[PDB]
């Protein structure tokens, strides 16, 4: 596990080519997240 | 230490979480290779995860980061798909849940798009699909994602290709 960039707590990876892709984020300490909801699901085949 | 409380489909909390899941599905550039082909989900269950030890760790660190960033945790609710979801809900996030090969460094990755995290539920690139059918686009088997409370603090902005 790497370190946060100096002076930062996380990285924001922001897609700059796909205009419809939302952002993705990295943290470098497990204490920076809490697994609050557990969602059980199926993907659905298009009609 | 962890207990799981089922939410009712009539409960507003369930509805807001489902809405966050359903509305943040997008198409992927792999045409569904990694996570399957779908425009939406059948939500089977939403459970609230309750662990006092793990919550207090989170808020202890959240306060820490707040103070290093003009009193601003920059707290978000984000998705995470992992084959290790069972371990995460009982023992917390740690180094073994890290994406060593990830493109923004060896850390724990989250997404605003539920469909992005769905690509990791059976492993990196979807691994070999569901365990019963070896099908990355399985419509039968039950998947699980985490919708997580995440402290970003001061977040290094990296534009990506
Ligand atoms: C244990 O190995 C793992 C576990 C989870 C993930 C994971 C899980 C995700 O939900 C995820 C979302 C966006 C992204 O860019 C990367 C992501 O990676 C990666 C490797
Ligand atoms: Zn299956």
Coordinates of N, CA and C in Angstrom, one line a residue, chain A residues 1-3 5 7-18 20-47, chain B residues 13 38 40-42 44-49 51 58 61 68 76 85 104 106-110 112-113 118 138-140 143-152 154-156 158 160:
Chain A
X1 N 0.8 -1.2 0.0 CA 0.0 0.0 0.0 C 0.9 1.2 0.0
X2 N 0.6 2.2 -0.9 CA 1.4 3.4 -1.1 C 0.9 4.4 -0.1
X3 N 1.6 5.6 -0.2 CA 1.2 6.7 0.6 C 0.4 7.7 -0.2
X5 N -0.3 11.3 -1.9 CA 0.7 12.3 -2.3 C 0.9 13.3 -1.1
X7 N 1.1 16.0 1.5 CA 0.1 17.1 1.8 C -1.4 16.8 1.4
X8 N -1.6 15.6 0.9 CA -3.0 15.1 0.4 C -3.5 13.9 1.2
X9 N -4.8 13.6 1.1 CA -5.3 12.5 1.9 C -5.9 11.4 1.0
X10 N -5.8 11.6 -0.3 CA -6.6 10.8 -1.2 C -6.2 11.3 -2.6
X11 N -6.6 10.4 -3.5 CA -6.5 10.9 -4.9 C -7.9 10.8 -5.6
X12 N -8.2 11.8 -6.4 CA -9.3 11.9 -7.3 C -8.9 11.6 -8.7
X13 N -9.3 10.4 -9.2 CA -9.0 10.1 -10.6 C -10.2 10.6 -11.5
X14 N -10.0 11.6 -12.3 CA -11.2 12.2 -13.0 C -11.1 12.0 -14.5
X15 N -11.9 11.1 -15.0 CA -11.8 10.8 -16.5 C -12.0 12.1 -17.3
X16 N -11.2 12.3 -18.3 CA -11.1 13.5 -19.0 C -11.5 13.3 -20.5
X17 N -11.6 12.0 -20.9 CA -12.0 11.7 -22.3 C -13.4 11.2 -22.3
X18 N -13.8 10.3 -21.5 CA -15.3 9.9 -21.4 C -16.0 11.0 -20.6
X20 N -19.1 11.2 -19.9 CA -20.1 10.5 -19.1 C -19.6 9.6 -17.9
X21 N -18.3 9.4 -17.9 CA -17.7 8.7 -16.7 C -17.6 9.5 -15.5
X22 N -18.1 9.1 -14.4 CA -18.0 9.8 -13.2 C -16.6 9.5 -12.6
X23 N -16.3 10.2 -11.4 CA -14.9 10.2 -10.9 C -14.7 8.9 -10.0
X24 N -13.5 8.6 -9.8 CA -13.0 7.4 -9.0 C -12.0 7.9 -8.1
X25 N -11.9 7.3 -6.9 CA -11.1 7.8 -5.8 C -10.3 6.7 -5.1
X26 N -9.1 7.1 -4.7 CA -8.2 6.2 -3.9 C -7.9 6.7 -2.5
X27 N -7.9 5.9 -1.6 CA -7.4 6.2 -0.2 C -6.3 5.2 0.1
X28 N -5.5 5.6 1.0 CA -4.2 4.9 1.4 C -4.2 4.5 2.8
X29 N -5.3 4.7 3.5 CA -5.6 4.2 4.9 C -7.0 3.6 5.0
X30 N -7.1 2.4 5.5 CA -8.4 1.7 5.7 C -9.4 2.5 6.6
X31 N -8.8 3.3 7.5 CA -9.6 4.0 8.5 C -10.3 5.2 7.8
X32 N -10.0 5.5 6.5 CA -10.7 6.6 5.8 C -12.0 6.1 5.1
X33 N -12.5 4.9 5.4 CA -13.8 4.5 4.9 C -14.5 3.6 5.8
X34 N -15.8 3.7 5.8 CA -16.7 2.8 6.5 C -17.7 2.2 5.6
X35 N -17.7 0.8 5.6 CA -18.6 0.0 4.7 C -20.0 0.1 5.2
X36 N -20.7 1.2 5.0 CA -22.0 1.5 5.7 C -23.2 0.6 5.2
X37 N -23.3 0.5 3.9 CA -24.4 -0.4 3.3 C -23.9 -1.5 2.5
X38 N -24.6 -2.7 2.6 CA -24.2 -3.9 1.9 C -25.5 -4.1 1.1
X39 N -25.3 -4.1 -0.3 CA -26.4 -4.1 -1.2 C -26.2 -5.5 -2.0
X40 N -27.2 -6.3 -2.0 CA -27.2 -7.6 -2.7 C -28.1 -7.5 -3.9
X41 N -27.7 -7.9 -5.0 CA -28.3 -7.6 -6.3 C -28.0 -8.5 -7.4
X42 N -28.8 -8.4 -8.5 CA -28.5 -9.1 -9.8 C -28.4 -8.0 -10.8
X43 N -27.6 -8.2 -11.8 CA -27.6 -7.3 -13.0 C -28.8 -7.9 -13.8
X44 N -29.4 -7.0 -14.6 CA -30.6 -7.4 -15.4 C -30.2 -7.4 -16.8
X45 N -30.6 -8.4 -17.5 CA -30.5 -8.5 -19.0 C -31.5 -7.6 -19.7
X46 N -31.0 -6.7 -20.5 CA -31.8 -5.8 -21.3 C -32.9 -6.5 -22.1
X47 N -34.1 -5.8 -22.2 CA -35.2 -6.2 -23.0 C -35.2 -5.6 -24.4
Chain B
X13 N -34.6 5.4 3.5 CA -33.2 5.1 3.4 C -32.8 4.1 2.4
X38 N -25.8 -4.8 -18.9 CA -27.0 -4.4 -18.2 C -27.2 -2.9 -18.2
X40 N -29.5 -1.8 -15.7 CA -30.0 -1.6 -14.4 C -29.9 -2.9 -13.5
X41 N -30.2 -2.8 -12.2 CA -30.1 -3.9 -11.3 C -31.5 -4.3 -10.7
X42 N -31.6 -5.6 -10.4 CA -32.6 -6.1 -9.4 C -32.0 -6.1 -8.0
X44 N -31.9 -6.9 -4.3 CA -32.6 -8.0 -3.6 C -32.7 -7.7 -2.1
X45 N -31.6 -7.0 -1.6 CA -31.5 -6.7 -0.2 C -30.6 -5.5 0.0
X46 N -30.9 -4.6 0.9 CA -29.9 -3.6 1.3 C -29.9 -3.7 2.9
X47 N -28.7 -3.9 3.4 CA -28.5 -4.0 4.8 C -27.5 -2.9 5.3
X48 N -27.9 -2.4 6.5 CA -27.0 -1.4 7.2 C -26.0 -2.1 8.0
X49 N -24.7 -1.7 7.8 CA -23.6 -2.4 8.6 C -23.2 -1.6 9.8
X51 N -20.9 -1.6 13.3 CA -19.8 -2.1 14.1 C -19.2 -0.8 14.7
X58 N -13.2 5.1 12.1 CA -13.5 6.0 11.0 C -13.6 7.4 11.4
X61 N -10.3 9.0 12.6 CA -9.5 9.5 11.5 C -10.2 10.6 10.7
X68 N -6.7 18.9 9.3 CA -5.6 19.2 8.3 C -6.1 19.8 7.0
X76 N -17.7 11.6 1.4 CA -18.5 11.2 0.3 C -19.1 9.8 0.6
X85 N -15.8 -8.6 0.3 CA -16.8 -7.8 1.0 C -17.1 -8.4 2.3
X104 N -3.9 4.8 -10.1 CA -3.6 5.9 -9.2 C -2.9 5.5 -8.0
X106 N -1.1 2.2 -5.4 CA -1.5 1.0 -4.6 C -2.3 1.5 -3.4
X107 N -3.6 1.5 -3.5 CA -4.6 2.0 -2.5 C -5.9 1.3 -2.7
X108 N -6.9 1.8 -1.9 CA -8.3 1.2 -1.9 C -9.1 2.2 -2.8
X109 N -9.7 1.6 -3.8 CA -10.4 2.3 -4.9 C -11.9 2.3 -4.7
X110 N -12.5 3.5 -5.0 CA -14.0 3.7 -4.9 C -14.5 4.3 -6.2
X112 N -18.0 6.5 -8.2 CA -19.3 7.2 -8.1 C -20.3 6.4 -9.0
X113 N -19.8 5.7 -10.0 CA -20.6 4.9 -10.9 C -20.7 3.5 -10.2
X118 N -19.1 -2.6 -9.9 CA -19.6 -3.9 -10.3 C -18.6 -4.7 -11.1
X138 N -23.2 -13.1 -15.7 CA -24.3 -13.8 -15.0 C -25.5 -13.0 -14.6
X139 N -26.7 -13.4 -14.9 CA -27.9 -12.7 -14.5 C -28.6 -13.4 -13.4
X140 N -28.1 -14.6 -12.9 CA -28.7 -15.5 -12.0 C -28.1 -15.3 -10.6
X143 N -24.9 -10.8 -6.5 CA -23.7 -10.0 -6.3 C -23.9 -9.1 -5.1
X144 N -22.8 -8.7 -4.5 CA -22.8 -7.7 -3.5 C -21.8 -6.6 -3.7
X145 N -22.2 -5.3 -3.5 CA -21.4 -4.1 -3.5 C -21.5 -3.4 -2.2
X146 N -20.5 -2.6 -1.8 CA -20.6 -1.8 -0.6 C -20.9 -0.3 -1.1
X147 N -21.8 0.4 -0.4 CA -21.9 1.8 -0.5 C -21.4 2.4 0.7
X148 N -20.2 3.0 0.6 CA -19.3 3.4 1.7 C -19.2 4.9 2.0
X149 N -19.1 5.2 3.3 CA -18.8 6.6 3.7 C -17.3 6.7 3.7
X150 N -16.8 7.7 2.9 CA -15.3 7.8 2.6 C -14.8 9.3 2.8
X151 N -13.7 9.4 3.5 CA -13.1 10.7 3.9 C -11.9 10.9 2.9
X152 N -12.1 11.9 2.0 CA -11.2 12.3 1.0 C -10.2 13.4 1.4
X154 N -8.1 16.6 1.6 CA -7.6 17.3 0.5 C -7.2 16.2 -0.5
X155 N -7.8 16.3 -1.7 CA -7.7 15.2 -2.7 C -7.0 15.7 -3.9
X156 N -5.9 15.0 -4.2 CA -5.1 15.3 -5.3 C -5.8 15.0 -6.6
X158 N -6.1 14.1 -10.2 CA -5.4 13.5 -11.3 C -6.4 13.3 -12.4
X160 N -7.4 11.8 -16.0 CA -7.1 10.5 -16.5 C -7.5 10.4 -18.0

